[PDB]
Write a protein that holds these residues in place. Structure first.
Motif, PDB file in Angstrom:
ATOM      1  N   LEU A 267     -33.395 -14.430  32.486  1.00 58.84           N
ATOM      2  CA  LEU A 267     -32.235 -14.445  31.584  1.00 58.84           C
ATOM      3  C   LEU A 267     -31.919 -15.847  31.091  1.00 58.84           C
ATOM      4  CD1 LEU A 267     -29.784 -13.121  30.233  1.00 58.84           C
ATOM      5  CD2 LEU A 267     -28.693 -12.953  32.474  1.00 58.84           C
TER       6      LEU A 267
ATOM      7  N   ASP B 244     -29.500 -18.038  30.439  1.00 59.88           N
ATOM      8  CA  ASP B 244     -28.069 -18.302  30.593  1.00 59.88           C
ATOM      9  C   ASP B 244     -27.800 -19.732  31.077  1.00 59.88           C
ATOM     10  OD1 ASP B 244     -27.508 -16.681  33.841  1.00 59.88           O
ATOM     11  OD2 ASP B 244     -28.901 -18.239  33.169  1.00 59.88           O
TER      12      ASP B 244
ATOM     13  N   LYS C 137     -26.721 -20.912  33.861  1.00 59.63           N
ATOM     14  CA  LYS C 137     -27.406 -21.088  35.130  1.00 59.63           C
ATOM     15  C   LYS C 137     -28.817 -21.601  34.860  1.00 59.63           C
ATOM     16  CE  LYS C 137     -25.249 -17.571  38.100  1.00 59.63           C
ATOM     17  NZ  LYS C 137     -25.688 -16.905  39.361  1.00 59.63           N
ATOM     18  N   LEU C 138     -29.510 -20.857  33.985  1.00 57.51           N
ATOM     19  CA  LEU C 138     -30.877 -21.248  33.669  1.00 57.51           C
ATOM     20  C   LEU C 138     -30.952 -22.676  33.121  1.00 57.51           C
ATOM     21  CD1 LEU C 138     -33.835 -20.690  33.562  1.00 57.51           C
ATOM     22  CD2 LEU C 138     -33.540 -19.870  31.214  1.00 57.51           C
TER      23      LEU C 138
END
Lengths: 125, 125
Positions: free
Chosen positions: B81, B83, B85-86
């Motif tokens: 994903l 996002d 976070k990524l």
């Protein structure tokens, strides 16, 4: 690269076989493709809407110890966790085609689309 | 098809470009493979371990309003994903690099490995 047909006779250790394929009534409705891999694998493809070619497909690459499962809609392929939930839902779909009740099939296929659109690939951070 | 290189020259609407690629201090160290698509998209590939070509990579496919992000380890490619976070993990990995002290970097790369092995593609049934 060879795409045999036999699956009603022989047997496999392959999960997707003894849990979905063999458990489906009239595989030929969904115009299945099944190939042998080198002999250590199976590469399966089923049309979800046989009437519109490659519109909505299920694909399963199986190997000696590993399985990978993919839903594909209009050309966009998404991976999905191979588990009971999926096996079942796949059976609901394929085992749901009845000429005297097309609407039911219609729906459960829509059920799977929803799953397709709902898939996210996530990690624990 | 075509592949530029200065992600510092042009301006982009590509989100992977502004959230990650432009914020990487030593972009060049990670042997980037950046191609333009039919302008309409961006194909990006970065080597997480430049020392071992294609061992551990990050891939990003951007088209107009869509992005798909992948991590590849030893030829095994998993979607992840895209996002915040990524974006935070990746920056931590590419910017932790310090040729005069690499331990920090060696460790955060491992942290990204941990993330890879953790990825699952699930749908709510």
């Amino acid at each position: 690269e060879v795409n045999p047909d036999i699956i009603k006779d022989e047997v496999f250790d392959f999960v997707i076989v003894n849990r979905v394929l063999k458990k489906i009534k009239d595989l030929k409705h969904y115009d299945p493709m099944i190939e042998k891999i080198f002999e250590m694998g199976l590469n399966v493809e089923i049309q979800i809407n046989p009437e519109v070619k490659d519109f909505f497909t299920f694909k399963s690459i199986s190997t000696t110890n590993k399985q990978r499962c993919f839903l594909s809609l209009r050309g966009e392929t998404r991976e999905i966790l191979c588990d009971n939930k999926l096996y079942n839902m796949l059976l609901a779909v394929f085992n749901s085609y009845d000429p005297n009740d097309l609407l039911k099939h219609i729906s459960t296929v829509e059920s799977l689309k929803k799953i397709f659109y709902t898939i996210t690939c996530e990690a624990v951070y």
